[PDB]
Design an enzyme around this catalytic site. Sequence first.
Site, mmCIF file in Angstrom:
data_model
loop_
_atom_site.group_PDB
_atom_site.id
_atom_site.type_symbol
_atom_site.label_atom_id
_atom_site.label_comp_id
_atom_site.label_asym_id
_atom_site.label_seq_id
_atom_site.Cartn_x
_atom_site.Cartn_y
_atom_site.Cartn_z
ATOM 1 C CG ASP A 1 2.812 6.501 -27.526
ATOM 2 O OD1 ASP A 1 2.887 5.289 -27.722
ATOM 3 O OD2 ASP A 1 1.736 7.107 -27.452
ATOM 4 C CG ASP B 1 2.071 1.222 -27.979
ATOM 5 O OD1 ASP B 1 2.781 2.220 -27.901
ATOM 6 O OD2 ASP B 1 0.920 1.171 -27.519
#
Length: 390
Positions: free
Chosen positions: A36, A232
């Site tokens: 992440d 992201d």
Amino acid sequence: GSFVEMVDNLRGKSGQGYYVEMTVGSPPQTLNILVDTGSSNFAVGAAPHPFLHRYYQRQLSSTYRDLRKGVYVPYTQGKWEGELGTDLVSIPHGPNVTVRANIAAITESDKFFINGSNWEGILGLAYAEIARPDDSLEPFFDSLVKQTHVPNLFSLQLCGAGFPLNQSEVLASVGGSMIIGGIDHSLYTGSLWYTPIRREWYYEVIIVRVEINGQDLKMDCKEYNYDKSIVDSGTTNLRLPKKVFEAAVKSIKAASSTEKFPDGFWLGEQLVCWQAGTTPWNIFPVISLYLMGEVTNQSFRITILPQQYLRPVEDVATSQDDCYKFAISQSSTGTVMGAVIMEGFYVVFDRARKRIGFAVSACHVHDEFRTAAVEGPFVTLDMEDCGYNI
Ligand SMILES: CN1C(=N)N[C@](CCC2CCCCC2)(CC2CCCCC2)C1=O
């Protein structure tokens, strides 16, 4: 490709996330961990959960250290709560090093764990500024670099399959590569182009121009970065600021007007299906995002295909049709270059030089007529004005 030990170390898909194998504790406890780049905490399931078949067992680790501190992390779609501590952590298919890192042992969560994702925790790769409870909790990658000789850089090749992967297939399929401490040249074609990391919190960048099939969306570039633009891997879609989303969807509808799609499709909620092999890729436009370059007044562009922004999904009938969901959606928190966009590129997070590099991915899905692209340079003026200031 000089990093063979790390090539092909990822599994997963855009909708449920890409993960890497890690070990925590002594003796080592193996866990799959979500990559992440949109958060900064290393947090792993540490208690029984309906969607977990394994979890971190602190009492079985001789190197476990309790920080005697809790952590609460609410996010848009859910939340995770846990207990802070440190322990020895390694990445089997990574650098041959072991480091002591902060670990949030998750004891309570809502809409965090995904049934069938095959991951039990998340690896927040962004900066300490957004770490919870605060910036004093050193992120994993910071610890890695401080404790070893690993270069302050990592690179991600997320590989979308271009079709649905059933439960057995997604477990046996290679989903990409996370190269820790370097750039593996076998993972991309063409040249790497770098855009500045605007500020070290999220991996923030600045978009200076947007095109749909070469047609300028023609918005004040500050709209493209309202209130920020980030890269992201923990977000599935390309998310765009409300006004930009409205303008982009209008343009994508116009380019694809030879076929009418239901409102639910454009809202990214319902799938659309075509007879096996007949997906009309050519009626859909390519999308180009121009990014600030490292040279004054210079920009470059990354171009994705509908093979990236249409996400493969299994038909509610498991039929033989090829079905997809529109993976572009609106945001009230800025632009998010999610997994479906990253699937078209090899992305280099060059922390050491405060820059993010993009190159065409050796595993991006395309057709015989079009390919994703990373091209430059372009003369672009006043790009600093494209950045948003609160
Ligand atoms: C989109 N996004 C993300 N990229 N990471 C989180 C947290 C973001 C942080 C950002 C800084 C403040 C604290 C939350 C977690 C989710 C990631 C996918 C799996 C479910 C949880 C999130 O909401």
